[PDB]
Design an enzyme around this catalytic site. Structure first.
Site, short mmCIF file in Angstrom:
data_model
loop_
_atom_site.label_atom_id
_atom_site.label_comp_id
_atom_site.label_asym_id
_atom_site.label_seq_id
_atom_site.Cartn_x
_atom_site.Cartn_y
_atom_site.Cartn_z
N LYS C 157 0.82 -1.20 0.00
CA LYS C 157 0.00 0.00 0.00
C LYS C 157 0.86 1.26 0.00
O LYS C 157 0.57 2.22 -0.72
CB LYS C 157 -0.93 -0.01 1.21
CG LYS C 157 -1.69 1.29 1.42
CD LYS C 157 -2.37 1.32 2.78
CE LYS C 157 -3.11 0.02 3.06
NZ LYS C 157 -3.76 0.04 4.40
N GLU C 183 -1.23 6.49 14.00
CA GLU C 183 -0.15 5.83 13.28
C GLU C 183 0.93 5.41 14.27
O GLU C 183 1.37 6.21 15.09
CB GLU C 183 0.43 6.76 12.22
CG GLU C 183 1.55 6.17 11.37
CD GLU C 183 1.05 5.18 10.32
OE1 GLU C 183 1.70 5.08 9.26
OE2 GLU C 183 0.03 4.51 10.55
N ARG C 184 1.34 4.15 14.18
CA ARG C 184 2.31 3.60 15.13
C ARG C 184 3.63 4.36 15.04
O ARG C 184 4.07 4.76 13.96
CB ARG C 184 2.53 2.12 14.86
CG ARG C 184 1.28 1.27 14.99
CD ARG C 184 1.49 -0.12 14.43
NE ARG C 184 0.24 -0.86 14.31
CZ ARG C 184 -0.63 -0.70 13.32
NH1 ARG C 184 -0.42 0.17 12.35
NH2 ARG C 184 -1.75 -1.42 13.32
#
Ligand SMILES: Nc1ncnc2c1ncn2[C@@H]1O[C@H](COP(=O)(O)OP(=O)(O)OP(=O)(O)O)[C@@H](O)[C@H]1O
Ligand SMILES: [Mg+2]
Lengths: 44, 495, 466, 466
Positions: C157, C183-184
């Site tokens: 992606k 978001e990590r």
């Protein structure tokens, strides 16, 4: 003939699973709504 | 002086009346009174107007209305450093093993901000679990937050203890938090760690079930502060300054339950499954502190191994979904496989590790690709296993190959295989060398082969371990040495 | 201004202000932290006489009741302009990368702007030419329209995002905004930093042509709720200059979950599936500023996480109510070495109708869908009975379907260093004509190969000749 | 230390005390009734100024809003000692049997006590010697552990309890305590009292070696909540005396339900499906007292009732989080004249690993339950094939499985006066050796009905030769 019958049965079984999964998801959401209603009511 | 007086004691919750100048997570004191020679500390969570609802860390049965409290100006801090190695402590850093006071010079505060974005580095160094299934198909690297999710008694803490034991000389300071576990279970875990000699690089925090919900709520944060001290400054282990750390939160389901109890007793508004709104924030603060620091900030690490006890494999539950979204990888342990006989109950079909091969040694990555592919092919044909007689030759061959690999992944308890043994055995299996061995004898063959290499052929094991980092691992003469070892073993032994 | 904290409950705080100059809703009150740093809380409610309920948007663990609170008098100020390009910010607009502060000379706009008025909306829908064959053919984009992508993040992606950014940068005005909602810090921040800095195009890295806003997981629910609004505030400055902007929101479901958590913290009643009661309004405050206006257009491609794969779930339902094109990355397609692993059957788009993309585009897309559907239907027959039993005039369709699914592969201008193959930009008209000429019968003698990681049909003809 | 009742809402009583004489959190109240006796309430929450909210433990159908209340200072005090042996008590410790009241010379201990510290917990799990072959082979107990029963009535659960009590009283001192928590008064009482007074061992009744505490469903929620703690106090006295104790808790799920009702009546918000927020802590404060210290051990064999068949329910989940083994009595095995209906399958234990029981025990327990792992799935092929007139090895494995199933039965020393057969006590070493020899094949050449009801394999051989 058995191959045709089993292929039709597997197709019907897979269609039934999709229908049941569709129905299970509705029951899953309704269970959450019920709980989020009693706890919120119990809070007040 | 600015102190406060308790005006209402509930199920472990005070109100403390007018205690001004109290920080939003201080640790109030409750000074000793008549009939009580010690002090019970509490965490002032709700700073309401004209009230400070503080949960009680100790026992609530003794704090009556009218008691005086003194707000110690300190936020919750824990001892850290070398002195904690091999000692069982409370989430407050107070020892409970009864072997003497904790020796320390530095206290790292609980609930500190995550290391940051630019502070970290990509995960490359692997955490050798010691379990073939995990160490081959679900790599765990230093800095990765791998979730061990299961269903009641399935082997989650067994996997965690195997991982902790496997770091005997891997230069890794393990930490075990044991949130809400029974005192007997934590005692047995500590006994197992002591028995295998793993209690010289392990810190075991523990907030057991009988302990108040405040202790269970702050246990993982104390554990990760103790781990952050290792990650940033490091400790002297085996004469080498180790800056890596491995932390295991034995139940974040029980931690979330404890926080839910704390929130509900404090009359905070509930959410889904009666959990408070910020339980995701809770677990994210906890886990996101596990990082792979770059060379600029020290090069340390902190590998987190959260463990969740699901019910009836309901992955879509609130806490399991939260932690799955937070974590970088999941190790599903299914009760069906556990009861079937596959003792390490990994469900490879759905267990994933987003770090991938980057958290594997080059030898391991080169060997495990075929294993993963063959296992996937076998899983895709699991419905034909009972119809093995009426099948194509290639389909059959795939089936017994999958059966052999699945039996190979089976492992006993407290038997971690070093990386060289794992790669040797999986190279033997991936190559068509175990086809003649019957399926129920694969485990015996593997054990005997490791014994053979350990006694007869130490040179090949040393050779595999020495060049496990080579990009083309099979190229070196190690390939022929290993092939000769396999051939000699298969000639000497019969099955 | 100059109020005092009255109550601290988790991330929800209440500040008492004088009877006048009470902060309005979404006013971003600021709490000094005893140093240069500060804690910014967004006012969400006004109670009684001066008391305002706000979400901490920070640690709120060192605060004490009675501490001074400074009212900013406006929603969260976010730096905008070319200074934001190539920089990483949190929700508050403070840069979280290694570079220094933005500086006072740079314009700051309120985070809570308003969607473009009714007259400013484009009456007609214009196709957005991404350049990727499969995306432009089966699930065409819409200029100023939302787009959803479904994938497990192991299906390339990020490579598709990088290709879209590079294509818009090199063939349009080309400024992109990445919204890292939830978001990590490790998987989703340093990894994407390294991929964007390493990926280059015409001597300019992808990172230098985009601005990334990271509302990380470890931040409180308010930050994850308002990071998308911060990203829109940054992108609307470039949209006001007439440029075309791609806004990438990672896991908009995390934005929905952050909104739900904020609503639960505030004490509001839980909607169906314990979602915020204001699900529609919250999803409309967002994703309505993503429109194609007269001056410029913002086209967004947002990742969507379907809770328990439940699409009826009000979160994905409300997301779908604001969508124009869906792209379904598939693991099985990615297992074979096709980087643009877009599932043609699952991916649809609203703009794929004769009245906009033309009759020929619709016809060729429908024919591709039909032949691929026939191939999908015959997968089981091939697996069970084999190729021989399948009759004539259908084996040709199966072969054409295999060749056409190998044809969706396309070299990427951002992956030319990794794969050693120059990227190819395929226009939508060229894609349509090439696929029509593949369907009508040309290239039948060509085997399944020579279609792999190729561009136009003339390119595969040249490869076959050589 | 005297107050006045303010409110009476069901079984929750709110009492106001003087400012400086407020009762502690778990103290008793002992509202004096007009006709001589007292109503012992238990404080649960100190609130306001001198006001305490207490649970009734009684009817509260005869109380006004001005009755005085006599704080006791200490929590519910219950008689403990050899005097409280062979007697039946309620939650308050008052003997409900026909015999006389407990004399004041007997020591009274508070019902609430802290569990043993971590330093005193045993660092190695030890198997508990019950003597039942199927119990000590497949699902061994744990010294200071917990075990659950999943079986209705008519499967001999009461007889299993009686055999366990007799074995622990004979082999060791084995003083036993039975806790009737929310059980039916017909089943819990007069079908346990009579079946244990009639049952005898070495001219001493089982009831004489057992302490019974009974809080039935008719009692208020507080009584069913604290009956377990009363039983734990009685067992903990003998544990402190150094004697091993077997403690039975009947329907611990009813203890959970009582906690839920108490919380609902106390004004606490519900958690999950209406359950109390303090579920895990309430389970911990009781189950953690069931542990094996160095001086003594309290082994527990509880019975768990799951509402419907829902194991996802929070009460069974919290119960199972504190379990070391499960025993599943089965109707089919009971109706096949095999009196110990312990199903070889569905009866797990965490002690069944080589590092505690031993390599031989684990090996023999794995060879058995493996031929039964299929539940003899061969039954279906026999059913639809007439055994096919030949099954090769399957005939041998079926014969061995049937032999083992018959051999799992063991004579009951408590049923010796009913079935007219002396009871045999089989140590774990005898079990493992006998089953090892049976799986090796010494059980062959011997027909069925010779392994039906015997103690050892040596006994089976002696029966065969005679
Ligand atoms: N790898 C293994 N090898 C052998 N036995 C194992 C293994 N893993 C688990 N077991 C068996 O399963 C039992 C329970 O395992 P474990 O304690 O890890 O479960 P759990 O999932 O942590 O359960 P709990 O919810 O009770 O904490 C062990 O006592 C042991 O008998
Ligand atoms: Mg466990």
């Amino acid at each position: 003939a058995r191959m045709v019958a089993m292929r039709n049965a597997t197709n019907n079984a897979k269609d039934l699973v999709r229908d049941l999964t569709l129905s299970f998801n509705k029951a899953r959401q309704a269970a959450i709504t019920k709980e989020v209603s009693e706890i919120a009511s119990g809070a007040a | 002086v600015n102190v406060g007086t308790v005006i209402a004691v509930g199920d472990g919750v005070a109100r403390l009346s007018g205690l001004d100048q109290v920080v939003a997570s201080e640790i109030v004191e409750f000074p000793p009174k008549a009939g009580r020679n010690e002090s019970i500390y509490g965490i002032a969570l709700n700073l309401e107007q004209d009230s400070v609802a503080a949960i009680i860390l100790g026992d609530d049965e003794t704090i009556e209305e009218g008691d005086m409290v003194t707000s110690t100006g300190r936020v919750i801090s824990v001892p850290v450093g070398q002195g904690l190695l091999g000692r069982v402590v409370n989430p407050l850093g107070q020892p409970i093993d009864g072997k003497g006071p904790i020796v320390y010079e530095k206290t790292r505060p609980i609930e500190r901000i995550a290391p940051g974005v630019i502070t970290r580095k990509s995960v490359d160094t692997p955490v050798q679990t010691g379990i073939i299934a995990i160490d081959a198909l679900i790599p765990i690297g230093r800095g990765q937050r791998e979730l061990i999710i299961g269903d009641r008694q399935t082997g989650k803490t067994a996997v965690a203890i195997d991982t902790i034991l496997n770091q005997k000389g891997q230069g890794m300071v393990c930490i075990y938090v044991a949130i809400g576990q029974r005192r007997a279970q934590v005692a047995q875990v500590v006994g197992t760690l002591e028995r295998f000699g793993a209690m010289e690089y392990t810190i075991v925090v523990s907030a057991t079930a009988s302990e108040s919900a405040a202790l269970q709520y702050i246990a993982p944060y104390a554990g990760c502060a103790m781990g952050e001290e290792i990650m940033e400054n490091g400790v002297m282990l085996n004469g080498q300054l180790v800056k890596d750390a491995l932390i295991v939160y034995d139940d974040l389901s029980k931690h979330a339950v404890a926080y839910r109890q704390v929130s509900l007793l404090l009359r905070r508004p509930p959410g889904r499954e009666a959990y408070p709104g910020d339980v995701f924030y809770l677990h994210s603060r906890l886990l996101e502190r596990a990082a792979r620091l770059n060379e600029e900030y020290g090069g340390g690490s902190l590998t987190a191994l959260p463990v969740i006890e699901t019910q009836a494999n309901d992955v879509s539950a609130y806490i399991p979904t939260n932690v799955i979204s937070i974590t970088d990888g999941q190790i599903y342990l299914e009760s069906d496989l556990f009861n079937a006989g596959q003792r390490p109950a990994l469900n490879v079909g759905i267990s994933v590790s987003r770090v991938g091969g980057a958290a594997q040694t080059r030898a391991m990555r080169a060997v495990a690709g075929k294993l993963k592919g063959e296992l996937a092919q076998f899983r895709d044909l699991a419905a034909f296993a009972q119809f093995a007689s009426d099948l194509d030759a290639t389909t059959k061959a795939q089936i017994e190959r999958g059966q052999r690999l699945q039996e190979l992944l089976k492992q006993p308890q407290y038997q971690p295989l070093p990386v060289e043994d794992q790669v040797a055995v999986l190279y033997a299996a991936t190559n068509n060398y175990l086809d003649d061995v019957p399926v129920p004898l694969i485990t015996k063959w593997r054990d005997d082969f490791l014994a053979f290499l350990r006694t007869a052929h130490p040179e090949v094991r040393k050779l595999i371990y020495d060049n496990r980092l080579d990009r083309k691992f099979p190229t070196p003469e190690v390939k022929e040495a290993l092939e000769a070892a396999i051939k000699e073993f298969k000639a000497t032994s019969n099955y | 201004a100059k109020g005092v904290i009255q109550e601290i409950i988790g991330v929800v705080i209440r500040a008492k202000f004088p009877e006048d100059e009470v902060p309005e809703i979404y006013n971003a009150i600021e709490i000094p932290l005893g140093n240069g740093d500060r804690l910014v809380c967004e006012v969400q409610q006004q109670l009684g006489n001066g008391v305002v309920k706000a979400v901490a948007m920070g640690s709120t663990d060192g605060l004490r009741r009675g501490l001074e609170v400074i009212d900013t008098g406006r929603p969260i100020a976010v730096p905008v302009g070319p200074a934001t390009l190539g920089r990483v910010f949190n929700v508050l607009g403070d840069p979280i990368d290694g570079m220094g502060p933005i500086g006072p000379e740079v314009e700051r706009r309120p985070i809570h702007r308003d969607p473009p008025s009714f007259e400013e909306q484009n009456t007609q829908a214009q196709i957005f030419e991404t350049g990727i064959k499969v995306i432009d053919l089966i699930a065409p984009f819409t200029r100023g329209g939302k787009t959803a992508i479904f994938g497990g993040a192991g299906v390339g992606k990020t490579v598709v995002i990088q290709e879209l950014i590079a294509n818009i940068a090199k063939e349009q005005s080309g400024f992109s905004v990445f919204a890292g909602v939830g978001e990590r810090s490790r998987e989703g921040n340093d990894l994407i930093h390294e991929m964007k800095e390493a990926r280059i195009d015409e001597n300019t890295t992808v990172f230098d042509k985009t601005v990334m806003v990271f509302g990380q997981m470890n931040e409180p629910p308010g930050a994850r709720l308002r990071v998308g609004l911060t990203a829109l505030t940054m992108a609307e400055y470039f949209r006001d200059e007439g440029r075309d902007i791609l806004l990438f929101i990672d896991n908009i479901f995390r934005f929905v979950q952050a909104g739900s958590e904020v609503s639960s913290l505030l004490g509001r009643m839980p909607s169906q599936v314990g979602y915020q009661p204001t699900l529609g309004t919250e999803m409309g405050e967002l994703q309505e500023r993503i429109t194609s206006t007269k001056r410029g257009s913002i086209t967004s491609m947002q990742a969507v996480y379907v809770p328990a794969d439940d699409y009826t779930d009000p979160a994905p339902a409300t997301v779908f109510s604001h969508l124009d094109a869906t792209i379904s990355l598939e693991r099985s397609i990615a297992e074979r070495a096709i980087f643009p692993a877009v599932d043609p059957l699952a991916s649809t788009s609203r703009i794929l109708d004769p009245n906009i993309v033309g009759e020929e585009h619709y016809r060729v897309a429908q024919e591709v869908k039909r032949v691929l559907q026939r191939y999908k239907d015959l997968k089981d027959i091939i697996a069970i009975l084999g190729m021989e039993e399948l009759s004539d005039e259908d084996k040709l369709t199966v072969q054409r379907a295999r060749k056409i699914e190998l044809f969706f592969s396309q070299p990427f201008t951002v992956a030319q260093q990794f794969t050693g193959r120059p990227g190819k930009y395929v226009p939508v008209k060229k894609t349509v004509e090439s696929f029509a000429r593949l369907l009508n019968g040309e290239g039948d003698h060509i085997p399944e190969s020579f279609f792999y990681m190729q561009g136009d049909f003339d390119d595969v003809l040249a490869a076959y000749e050589a």
